Amino acid sequence: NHVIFKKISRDKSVTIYLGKRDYIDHVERVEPVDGVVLVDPELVKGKRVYVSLTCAFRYGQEDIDVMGLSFRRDLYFSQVQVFPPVGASGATTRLQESLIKKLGANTYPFLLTFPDYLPCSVMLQPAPQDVGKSCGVDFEIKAFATHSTDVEEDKIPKKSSVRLLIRKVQHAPRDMGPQPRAEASWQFFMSDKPLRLAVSLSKEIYYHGEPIPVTVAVTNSTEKTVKKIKVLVEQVTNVVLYSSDYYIKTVAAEEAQEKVPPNSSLTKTLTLVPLLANNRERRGIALDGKIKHEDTNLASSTIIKEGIDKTVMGILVSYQIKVKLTVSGELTSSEVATEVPFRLMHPQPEDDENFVFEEFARQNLKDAGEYKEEKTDQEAAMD
Template identity: 50%
Template sequence: MPKEDMGNYGPKLGVDWTMYTQVIVNLCLLAVHQSLTARHGYAVQPLGLISCQKAAQHITAALRVKCELSKIWSGPQSVTMSPKHVVFKKVSKDKLVAVYMAKRDFVDHCDFVDPVDGVIVIDQGQLKGKKVYVMLSCTFRYGRQDMDVMGVAFRRDLFVVTRQVYPELQDKEKLTHTKVQQKLLHKLGDNAFPFFFEFPDNLPCSIALQPGPSDVGKKCAVEFEVKAFCCENQDEKINKQSSVRLTIRKIQFSPENSKLVPVAETTFEFLMSEKPLHLKLSLPKETFYHGEPIPVTVEITNSSSRNIKDISVSVEQVTNIVLYSNDKYVKSVAKEETSDSVPSGTSLKKDYTLYPLLAHNKDRRGLALDGRLKHEDTNLASSSIVKQEVLKEVQGMLVSYKVIVRMIASGTIGSSEVSLELPFKLMHSNPEPAKEGESDDMVFEEFKRAYLKGVVYGSDDESPTEA
C-alpha cells in the first residue's frame, strides 16, 4: 500500500499514525525498563514513557489497523494450504533401486497391525535381465557378531517373506492398497512398482538392549527390516551396491485403559513383636504412557515394635531373554529416596511421584529400549503384550514394569528390609487415526532418523548414512 494511502486509511480507523509510532517506540522502552528492573532487583526510572493506560488504548487501535491492513495486502481471497504428505526414501549406491515409504514406525494395535507398504523405483536400463525383490524380516540378535564365524548362532530369523516386484507378477492395481501408494505411482512414473506386506499376529515389537561401553560388538535386539535388491534369483548372494536396507520399527500402542485400580498389600510379622506391620501400595490406573508421571500411594500401618525408616519408592524395568538363554535384567529407571519414618504405633499415608524417562537413564547398561539410543525418537521399551496362543519364546525378549517400595524395619535385635511390589504397564498412547488428505503434494525426506547430538558411533554401530 502506498504511503499516501496509509495516511488516508488511518483516520478512517480512528488511529493517529504519529501516536501509533510513538506507542511502538515507548513499548520497546517499557520492555527494556521491565527487564532492567527484573535483572537488577531495583526500580529503574523510565525516560519519556507515556502512561501504560494510554498505551493500552492505542494498542487496541493499532491491532485493529494491523488486522485491516492484512486484509488489504493479502487481497480479497484467503488461501488455505493443504497438508503435504511426508514420504521417506532411500536409494541404493548404484542408483539402481530406490524405496519410498510413508512410514518408519508401524503400530501394533493388539487386534491388528499396520501393514507395511511402499513403492520401489527401478532403473530398468541397469537391470540387464535381473529381477527385483523386496523382503520383510524380523530378526532376533543375541551375542557377539563374531560368534557366527565360530559356528554359534548369533541371530535367528523369526519371520521372513520375499516378494518379486519386477517383472510384475500381478497388475499394479491389485498390489496397490493405499492412497499414498496411488499418489506415489502417479508421481514417480512407469518405473515405480508397489509392494505390500502384512505382519502375522505372533511377532514381537522392536526392542533393543542397550549395551555398555565395554560391550563392543555385542548386540541384543528384535529388529525389523525392509530390504530391496536385484539379482538373478532371490537365493543368490545379494550385491550390497544394488540393495537398500531400511530398519523399521514395530511399536506397541496401548489398548483401552481398563478401569482396574492396581493395589497390593501385605503384612509382616517380626520376632519379639506381638503385632504386625501392614503395607499397602496403589496406583490410580494400570497403564501409563511414556513421559507421563506415575503417582504412587504408600500406606504404612506400623503396629509392630519396630521403627520404619529409609523409605524408598522406585520403578523397575524387568527384561527377560526367552530365546537362546534365560538371562534377566532388572534395572531401576526412576527412584525417590526419602527420609520419612514411621515409629512404632504410628501410621503414614503419602503420595510419591516417579518419572521413568530414558533421558535420566542414558548411561545404564542392559536397559530395554524401543529403538536405538542414538535416535531422537527412542523411548524406554513398552510393556510386552503376549497374545493368546502365542509362544513366549517367539517373542525373543519380554519387558515388564513394576513399582517397588522398600524400607528398613529396625529393632533392638537387628534390622531387616521389607518391600512390596506392584506391576503396571508402560506404553505409547494410542493416537487418533491419521486422515488422508486429497492433496497430491509430497515432501521427500531421507529415511535415516535424526541422531542425538554428541553421539559417538562405534565400529559395531551403524553409521549415520545407514537406515
C-alpha cells in the same frame, strides 16, 4: 505435509519410499508396510526387484580376542515382487497411488503385512556389570534387484539392495475396558505386631511419558521406625531365546524424606515417569531401538497372545513399582520390599497429500553415554 522416508541403493538402481519409520502394533492388528520402489529402468533391464520383510532375533557382539559367537532366529519372512509389476501386493493404498503420481512412471507399489504372533522392537546392549551379550529383535524392509541366474548361485549383489530397520511399536488397543486400580497390601509381622504396606496405582496401563501416581500407605503398629521409603519403576528383561539372560534396572526413582514412627501411619503419593532420558546410561535396559538414536525409547511391556509360546517373543519386557522400606533395628536396620506390576506402552491409535522426502536414517543423540559401536553396514565397494 506428509514426511516420506527414502533410501537409495549404492548403485542408484533402486530407491525405497516408506510412509513411516515406525509401524503400530495395537494388539488387535498391526499396521501393514505400504511403500513404493523407484527403479532406474536402465539399471534394472532384465532384472527383477523384490521387497522382503524379515523379523529376526539375534544374540552376540564382536569382542577383542574373545571367541566370535552369534545366534540368529528368523521369526517372520515375507517377500513380494515389485518390478516388473504383477500386483503381488494386491490392490493399492491411497499413499501408494499419490506417491506414484508424485514420483512418476518408474514407481511401483509394495505391501507387506505383519502377522499377530510377533514381538515388538526390543533390543539391549549390556552394561559393564551385566553378563549376557547384545541381543535384539530387528525388523528389516529390504528392496533388492536379482538377475536371471543370481538366486540360483546365492549372489544377490549388495550394491543393488537397500535395507531399512523399521520399528514395530506397541500401542494400547483402540477398545479396552475401564481400568482396575493396580493395588496390593502386605502385613510384615515384627515381634507379632504388623507393619502394613498398601501400594496403589491409578490404573494398570500407563503410556510412555505419562506420570505414574504411586500411593503408598504405611500403617506401623510395630515398636520399630520406618526410617526410609524408596519407590522405583523397575524394568525386568528376560531373554528367552539362545540364552536366559536376566536384567532388572531402575528407570525412575523417588526416595522420600518421610519417617513412620511406632504406632502411627503415613499415606504418601509419589509421581514417577519411567523415561530413557532419566539415565545417561542407556546400556543394560530393553530399548525399542539403538542406544545412539534420539527417537529410541524404553521397550514397551511384552504382550503375549493366547496360544503363543513366550519364547518366540525373543525378549520379555515387564515393568513394576518397587517399594522398599528401611525399618530401624538396634545398631543396624532391615529393608522390606514389594512389587506392583503394571504395563507401559504407547497411547491408543487415532481413526491428495503434499509430500516432503527425507533420509530414512534416524538422528543421533548428542549424548548417549558409553556404548559399543556395532558392525558397520557391509554395503560398501564390493565388486
